[PDB]
Amino acid sequence: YLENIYSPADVKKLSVKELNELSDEIRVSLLQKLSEHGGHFGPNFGMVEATIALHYVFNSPKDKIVFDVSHQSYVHKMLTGRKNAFLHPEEYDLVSGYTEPQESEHDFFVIGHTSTSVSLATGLAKGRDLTGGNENIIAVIGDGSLSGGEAFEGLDYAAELGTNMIIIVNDNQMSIAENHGGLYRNLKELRDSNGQCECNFFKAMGLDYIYVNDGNDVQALIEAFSKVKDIQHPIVVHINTLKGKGYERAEQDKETYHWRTPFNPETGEAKVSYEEEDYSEVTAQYLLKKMKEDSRVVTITSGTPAVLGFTPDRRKEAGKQFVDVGIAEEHAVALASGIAANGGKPVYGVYSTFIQRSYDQLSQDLCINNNPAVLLVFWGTLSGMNDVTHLCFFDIPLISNIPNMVYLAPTCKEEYLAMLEWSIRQNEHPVAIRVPATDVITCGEPVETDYSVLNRYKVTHRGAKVAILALGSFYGLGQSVASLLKEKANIDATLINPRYITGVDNELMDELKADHELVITLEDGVLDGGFGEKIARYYGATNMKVLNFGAKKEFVDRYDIQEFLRANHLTDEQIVEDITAVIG
Amino acid sequence: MYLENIYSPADVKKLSVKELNELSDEIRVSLLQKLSEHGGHFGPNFGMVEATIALHYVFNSPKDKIVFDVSHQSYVHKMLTGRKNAFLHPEEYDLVSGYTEPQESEHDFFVIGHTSTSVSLATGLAKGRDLTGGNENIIAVIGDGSLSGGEAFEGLDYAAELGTNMIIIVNDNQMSIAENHGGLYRNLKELRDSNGQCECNFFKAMGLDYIYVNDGNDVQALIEAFSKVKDIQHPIVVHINTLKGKGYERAEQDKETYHWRTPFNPETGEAKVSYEEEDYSEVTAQYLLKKMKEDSRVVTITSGTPAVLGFTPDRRKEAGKQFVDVGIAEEHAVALASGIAANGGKPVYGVYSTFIQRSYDQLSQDLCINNNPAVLLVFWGTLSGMNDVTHLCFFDIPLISNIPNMVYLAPTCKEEYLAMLEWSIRQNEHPVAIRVPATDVITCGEPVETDYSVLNRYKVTHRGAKVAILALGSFYGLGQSVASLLKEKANIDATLINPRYITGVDNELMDELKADHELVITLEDGVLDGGFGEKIARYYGATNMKVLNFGAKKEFVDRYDIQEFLRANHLTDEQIVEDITAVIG
Numbered sequence A: 001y002l003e004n005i006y007s008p009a010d011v012k013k014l015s016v017k018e019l020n021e022l023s024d025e026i027r028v029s030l031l032q033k034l035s036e037h038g039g040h041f042g043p044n045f046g047m048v049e050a051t052i053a054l055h056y057v058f059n060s061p062k063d064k065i066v067f068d069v070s071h072q073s074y075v076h077k078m079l080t081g082r083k084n085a086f087l088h089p090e091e092y093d094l095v096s097g098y099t100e101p102q103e104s105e106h107d108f109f110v111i112g113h114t115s116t117s118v119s120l121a122t123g124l125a126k127g128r129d130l131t132g133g134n135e136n137i138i139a140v141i142g143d144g145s146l147s148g149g150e151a152f153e154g155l156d157y158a159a160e161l162g163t164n165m166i167i168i169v170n171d172n173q174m175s176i177a178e179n180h181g182g183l184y185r186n187l188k189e190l191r192d193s194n195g196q197c198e199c200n201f202f203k204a205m206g207l208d209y210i211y212v213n214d215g216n217d218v219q220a221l222i223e224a225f226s227k228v229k230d231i232q233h234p235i236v237v238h239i240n241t242l243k244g245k246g247y248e249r250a251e252q253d254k255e256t257y258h259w260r261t262p263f264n265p266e267t268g269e270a271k272v273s274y275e276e277e278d279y280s281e282v283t284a285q286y287l288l289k290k291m292k293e294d295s296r297v298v299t300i301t302s303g304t305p306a307v308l309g310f311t312p313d314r315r316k317e318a319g320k321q322f323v324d325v326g327i328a329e330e331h332a333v334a335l336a337s338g339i340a341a342n343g344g345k346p347v348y349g350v351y352s353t354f355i356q357r358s359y360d361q362l363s364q365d366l367c368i369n370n371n372p373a374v375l376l377v378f379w380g381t382l383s384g385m386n387d388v389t390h391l392c393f394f395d396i397p398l399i400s401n402i403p404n405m406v407y408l409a410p411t412c413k414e415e416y417l418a419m420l421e422w423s424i425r426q427n428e429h430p431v432a433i434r435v436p437a438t439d440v441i442t443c444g445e446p447v448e449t450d451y452s453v454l455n456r457y458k459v460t461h462r463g464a465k466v467a468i469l470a471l472g473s474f475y476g477l478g479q480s481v482a483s484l485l486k487e488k489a490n491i492d493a494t495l496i497n498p499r500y501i502t503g504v505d506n507e508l509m510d511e512l513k514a515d516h517e518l519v520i521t522l523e524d525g526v527l528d529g530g531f532g533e534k535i536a537r538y539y540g541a542t543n544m545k546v547l548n549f550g551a552k553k554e555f556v557d558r559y560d561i562q563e564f565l566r567a568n569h570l571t572d573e574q575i576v577e578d579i580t581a582v583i584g
Numbered sequence B: 001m002y003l004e005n006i007y008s009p010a011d012v013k014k015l016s017v018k019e020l021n022e023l024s025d026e027i028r029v030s031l032l033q034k035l036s037e038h039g040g041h042f043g044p045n046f047g048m049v050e051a052t053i054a055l056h057y058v059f060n061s062p063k064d065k066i067v068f069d070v071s072h073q074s075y076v077h078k079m080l081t082g083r084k085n086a087f088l089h090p091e092e093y094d095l096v097s098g099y100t101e102p103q104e105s106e107h108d109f110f111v112i113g114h115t116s117t118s119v120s121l122a123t124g125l126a127k128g129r130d131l132t133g134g135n136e137n138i139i140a141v142i143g144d145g146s147l148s149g150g151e152a153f154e155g156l157d158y159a160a161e162l163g164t165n166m167i168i169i170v171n172d173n174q175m176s177i178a179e180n181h182g183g184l185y186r187n188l189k190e191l192r193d194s195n196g197q198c199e200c201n202f203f204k205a206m207g208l209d210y211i212y213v214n215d216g217n218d219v220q221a222l223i224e225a226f227s228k229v230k231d232i233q234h235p236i237v238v239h240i241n242t243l244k245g246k247g248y249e250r251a252e253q254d255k256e257t258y259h260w261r262t263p264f265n266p267e268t269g270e271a272k273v274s275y276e277e278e279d280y281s282e283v284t285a286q287y288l289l290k291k292m293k294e295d296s297r298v299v300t301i302t303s304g305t306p307a308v309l310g311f312t313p314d315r316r317k318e319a320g321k322q323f324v325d326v327g328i329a330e331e332h333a334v335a336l337a338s339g340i341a342a343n344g345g346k347p348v349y350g351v352y353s354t355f356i357q358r359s360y361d362q363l364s365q366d367l368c369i370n371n372n373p374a375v376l377l378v379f380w381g382t383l384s385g386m387n388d389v390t391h392l393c394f395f396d397i398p399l400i401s402n403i404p405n406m407v408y409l410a411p412t413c414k415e416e417y418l419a420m421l422e423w424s425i426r427q428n429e430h431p432v433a434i435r436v437p438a439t440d441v442i443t444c445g446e447p448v449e450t451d452y453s454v455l456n457r458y459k460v461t462h463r464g465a466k467v468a469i470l471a472l473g474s475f476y477g478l479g480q481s482v483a484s485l486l487k488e489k490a491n492i493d494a495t496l497i498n499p500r501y502i503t504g505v506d507n508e509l510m511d512e513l514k515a516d517h518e519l520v521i522t523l524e525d526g527v528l529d530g531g532f533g534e535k536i537a538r539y540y541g542a543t544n545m546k547v548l549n550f551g552a553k554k555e556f557v558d559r560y561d562i563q564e565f566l567r568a569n570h571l572t573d574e575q576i577v578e579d580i581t582a583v584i585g
């Protein structure tokens, strides 16, 4: 039946007995693509019956559906014209892993971050209302995403529309790990009272409410969804789904199966089984030790403990000293700041792309008060996650231009661990550390253990004519540029490990004027608002020439990394070529 | 006077109920004098008198810790914790800021100005206590308006998991700055109308314990409630109903006006300087009321600060469904605007520079990744305006201009501003932000471009040589003056440029200047790091062009003297000219 689904109209042609068979067909096809190609396993298997019912009852694209995150919209794409991308291995990559309007009229937003569906959906509804449309507007949002303040604001506003607004809460009792927040006790009393409970968070927020206990039964959902169709006021449809339904291993281990690398369908084991530790593992190793020796130390995550190497066992080990605040980046920062104000030693670890949510809290809650909380920022690089919503391109311009902030850029493992140890020990600054997005590199030479004199860059090779400031993960690159500059142009360049993203070594920059005419900067991130521009500004009235290397200010999506680097001149021979072109 | 003998909460605990009530009276008298003479947040502090007395009657600050949301309503806190003379003697009026400040007092635990952060910062204090085995009480005080902000939701959500002492005072006076907005406020009405007994309780749904206090301006009732929860061993909400501006008739009848007053006549309520003339907020209101009438797809959005758009309660009435107030939810305001523009609407979101700082990810992902043509109006961006540390409008350029796909415009005069806003509404190709000039309303006097679709065209306004001046936005006048004095003092005829586009560089014009110029300077009204000027420096980095960038340093300042600060950053005509000559010779 699935081979003949080209739009929601074809879904409406089926009998209910046929809808159930289609559910099976979808799961078979998902099992193949997801085991071969990786992806969000649990969220999509759990969403099968609700997506069929959604496109059975509603008339997309007049009616519009918005998924929170969109990591769970595979079945949506499967039923709106993109099935061939899931049935034929040769076409696995013809769709992104998130919603995309360029692919389909059935997709209204590129979405990857959490708790944004409800807000964007109310945008659609208000737009309808101002222009006299009459379509249904649906947001689909996970129970974990409910912990984000943007979703609270969206619900708050939705309760005021006075018009059609449909909010499907997909309650599978799981975020990535387990949920956290007192709200989840409310969700729970409601499931147990079959939606009957008087004290209802959603009703307290001003909204109407209905509950569906069998979130994996096409009939129940069609029933539910038909009841709310063409409704004229805001309503919540709270449904209970079983995360990863239809695949035993997923049902028994929900955290592991939220996202899988390619694996064996029969055993569930990954296809490539060797792994060497990454900086996440290291970091978990360090904090479990420190937290044992020093009861003031507390590790914090916003719904992504794995970014800190914190398996369910390790969380258990850490007990009261490991905190998961839900998907609430804003709060994580203010919490860290208050902890540090009343004698605790907080360490908040977060992805670069997600820390984008907390600019004002970093600035006001944290830095105005100058509290010594520690922030670890992971995966900041131009060569990592490469879909547009998860681009870790912007943390240097996000963070490094805030007053009072100290942002450190380690280049190797012992240095990373030394700044982190010093971070916890000091009491004078908020400290953020850009965890290197590389394999774990051994420093091989003893490293400074005190970073209290700010903005001292470390010369690692005395040279002349050209100086290279190779920041963080791009130290390796500065090293290769040094070699190739020597072998092809016989320039012996000064190589510099800057360490401090948040300031300029004025005195060294001055000393370089003597035996150098060109300084270049390499940074693993976008150029606008980043580190290199400060160097350009410092030399602006002097006879020192400067080149800045990094990523251009532009969105890119599922790109080839070799290209993107070359396109931005981030290769050793492109850099040396540019130097000589400037020198002569 | 009892108030002259208060140096700490210990002194507050000495009084009887009759003396506490007399003390309430003295505080209001003293407040009326300070606020009518010196201005300030009138309504919120008059509403908080009895609750602040009771707090320091029952709790033992600074061992116990109190955190005020925003802290605009912490004047009585200061009056009862040792800083009373800053409220009794006019000569010392300025010896305290209008917000909490730890440098002033150990009774102050955070510098706080923005909304909905108390609960989160307070839970931090509690978690820290818990990690070190303290046993002090931890209190957050939050207004009903601040509850509409998502940080407050996350904080409550987290607090409900502590399993330890946590006291959250909700000061419900049924007002934000204007009236509240959000469905949650209907549940608050239910709770107040049922004297806290209603089954449907938002606070209990969040995992929290709860009690209600119907007379939030009665010392006895508050002492009562606060004593019951003292040393409680789990998180609790104490929901109290206060009358905004209690004790002063004119404020009680107009709560929106008296949220904040310039100095005024205690007897008439009239401002001491009553002449008012049109500013860009007023201009903006006029434009949007016209367009919204002519074009039914236009909708104006505020995040609880409608005055920033000149939107008096009448004007809101007029605009009806076409004027939207989303509460204090800056983040949501952006995503709403983006969804509106995706479904045939034309949204115009107006916001203060200092507050738009909340929405970086929403600007980036909700708005700019999808490239939706929502319009953003960013007010008060300047180094010469609001000058307390938490309300510094220094950072909107580095916050916004480095987001990909964003078009961010800097008008220099009034006709240009409106022409830029008209085009913004008409185009369908870009998200557009407009940095409303933080100057007097200046008439352009020469006809202005009406189409801004070809991006990154800087407008040469005077052809010269040797030195070129890129004077962005509010600093166009300053660039005009640097040109004059350069001409009068060094006999250089400098090229003057109005750049307009903050978000890009005129490659072509920048290249042509290399012919008849050796120096380029940039002037911007904001912090330099991540700002406009650095893109010019970077562009010329490999050329023989020299560049200077003028703006504010990356540094926090608080209640500063503005002339001083300008001089310190070389932001004067005589300092810029001097630096130019110092580079040339």
Ligand SMILES: Cc1ncc(C[n+]2csc(CCOP(=O)(O)OP(=O)(O)O)c2C)c(N)n1
Pocket (backbone or CB within 6 Å): A042, A043, A069, A071, A072, A112, A113, A114, A141, A142, A143, A144, A145, A146, A172, A174, A175, A176, A243, A258, A303, A304, A327, A354, A357
């Ligand atoms: C802003 C932001 N913060 C954090 C994340 C991390 N994240 C990606 S998917 C996901 C799961 C969301 O949980 P829920 O909505 O309950 O869905 P489920 O996995 O249970 O289907 C999370 C936390 C994100 N994508 N964006």
Ligand SMILES: Cc1ncc(C[n+]2csc(CCOP(=O)(O)OP(=O)(O)O)c2C)c(N)n1
Pocket (backbone or CB within 6 Å): B044, B070, B072, B073, B113, B114, B115, B142, B143, B144, B145, B146, B147, B173, B175, B176, B177, B244, B259, B304, B305, B328, B355, B358
């Ligand atoms: C982030 C942010 N957005 C907006 C404001 C504007 N603002 C300043 S004071 C205030 C009033 C808050 O109202 P409420 O919390 O109910 O207190 P009340 O004035 O009624 O005592 C507002 C909206 C702000 N300070 N910070």
Ligand SMILES: [Mg+2]
Pocket (backbone or CB within 6 Å): A142, A143, A144, A145, A170, A171, A172, A173, A174, A175
């Ligand atoms: Mg979930």
Ligand SMILES: [Mg+2]
Pocket (backbone or CB within 6 Å): B143, B144, B145, B171, B172, B173, B174, B175, B176
């Ligand atoms: Mg209020």
